[PDB]
Amino acid sequence: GVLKIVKVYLAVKRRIQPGDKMAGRHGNKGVISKINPIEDMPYDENGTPV
Amino acid sequence: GPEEITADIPNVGEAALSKLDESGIVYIGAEVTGGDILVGKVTPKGETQL
Amino acid sequence: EFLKPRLVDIEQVSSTHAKVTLEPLERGFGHTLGNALRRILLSSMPGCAVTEVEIDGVLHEYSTKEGVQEDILEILLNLKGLAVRVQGKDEVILTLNKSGIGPVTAADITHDGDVEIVKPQHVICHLTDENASISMRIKVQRGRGYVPASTRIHSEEDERPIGRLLVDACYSPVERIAYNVEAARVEQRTDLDKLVIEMETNGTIDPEEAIRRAATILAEQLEAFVDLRD
Secondary structure (H helix, E strand, O other), rough: OOOOOOOOOOOOOOOOOOOEEEEEEOOEEEEEEEOOOOOOEEEEOOEEEE | OOEEEEOOOOOOOOOOOOOOOOOEEEEEOOOOOOOOOOOOOOOOOOOOOO | OOOOOOOOOOOOOOOOOOEEEEEEEOOOHHHHHHHHHHHHHOOOOOOOEEEEOOOOOOOOOOOOOOOOOOOOOHHHHOOOOOEEEEEOOOOEEEOEEEEEEEEEEEOOOHHOOOOEOOOOEEEEEEEEEOOOOOOOOOOEEEOOOEEEEHHHOOOOOOOOOOOOEEEOOOOOOOEEEEEEEEOOOOOOOOOOOEEEEEEOOOOOOHHHHHHHHHHHHHOOOHHHOOOOOH
8 A cells, every 4th residue: 555665864962951860870860950050060179170 | 646755845935845855855964853844745635625 | 458469470380281370469358359260260261162064075973984983973072172273363264184094183284374273183083094085174263151053053044055064162261270379478468368370271272361351351240330320
């Protein structure tokens, strides 16, 4: 009953955003709640933010 | 009747038919987004009765 | 009767490191200026970075040219960390041609008059054939912050070609800014500090120029409180 088929492949690159779900190995799930700017994050004496 | 893969779709704006080639199928490399047309097709339909 | 901090000598540890000092800082002001500046430098410094590459025979980022040993999605991740200076213009269009076995570095970009590539050994890709070849037309712009490629898709203005690969742009010359307020001893005073802003850039922004460009962002923003207009 078919005549011709056409298959198309889109390659979308999904970045990260609030609502996503991350997790370490030891069973500590989580959901991202914010993306702070670089300068709000805490920094040690050297200035390197976490 | 048999459906077709016409590159000319009834009453669709020219902006939507920008990436479809003359054969009807989208080019390989185009950046499509929500709502765009990837493969033009028209199904016959008579007996209007408006 | 406050004192005025005056810019003093600028130790330069490397091409990318630096340290400044603001000698006669009054008591309690070492931390008021110290952190007021560090939130200005990490946020709003103008720099230039790549904005869209266009290679000769490749259509999309998920392709693979024959002759190099990296995807076209992996050459774009090496270009995104290309440190470059543009003297007078706003946007430039660099060029890179090369053939023959061996790595392709930033030193092989067609040397324009203004565009001054700063890290000339930055590897881009390797050519693993005697009769291979790459030809790309990079583009450079000026801006601040970080603007992804998705945002610029709204300001494409009928981006006619389909061979125009877009890279995300992060125009910011600074990567970390520490500071330390220690004791300064003027010839006769009891309370005085000395700020030491140890900034580390990617060789693009000048240190002395990078701190005056901050105070004119802060003193220009405090124009609103000097006169409250209701």
